[PDB]
């Protein structure tokens, strides 16, 4: 189990979504060039997500309007990755009874999460904490 909890947040993959960051109301981003941010319009073309599960619990999250993966790279950063691979998993865990948190599996053992700052830019994989606001993510079907 990766040495990680096991509590999965309900629902399934079917529909893509959004992911709305309870830390600054922020939806998760991921720009044509790569860039990965929040941003709190709905109008926006790149936060339709589109997830998918490797194994269960672990995931994939790809724009369904560039096709890109998100991915955390070796210093902690996110970034929309062309290709699907290890830095573009996530264990995606259900957090107090009630958010979903994404995990980089390539950082597990460091506790990585994805998360978004209140201004809507991204943390840093070193600086996101169980505890935070800023990693805790509520889906959305679109």
């Known amino acids: 189990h990766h040495h990680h909890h096991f509590n999965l947040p309900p629902g399934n993959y079917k529909k893509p979504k959004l992911l709305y960051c309870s830390n600054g109301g922020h939806f ?3 720009l044509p060039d790569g860039t990965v941010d ?3 319009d709905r109008s926006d073309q790149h936060i339709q997500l589109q997830l998918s599960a490797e194994s ?4 994939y999250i790809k724009s369904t309007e560039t096709g890109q ?3 955390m790279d070796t210093d902690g950063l996110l970034y929309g990755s062309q290709t699907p691979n290890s830095e573009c998993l996530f264990l995606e865990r259900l957090e107090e009874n009630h958010y979903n948190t994404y995990i980089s ?3 597990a053992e460091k506790n990585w999460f994805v998360g978004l700052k ?3 830019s991204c943390k840093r994989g ?3 904490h ?3 606001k800023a990693i805790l993510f509520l889906p959305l079907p679109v």
């Open 28 to 30: 998760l981003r991921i």
């Open 38 to 40: 929040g941003t709190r």
């Open 56 to 59: 269960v619990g672990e995931v």
């Open 69 to 71: 993966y998100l991915a």
């Open 105 to 107: 599996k390539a950082h």
């Open 118 to 120: 209140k201004n809507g």
């Open 126 to 128: 070193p600086r996101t």
């Open 130 to 132: 169980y505890g935070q």
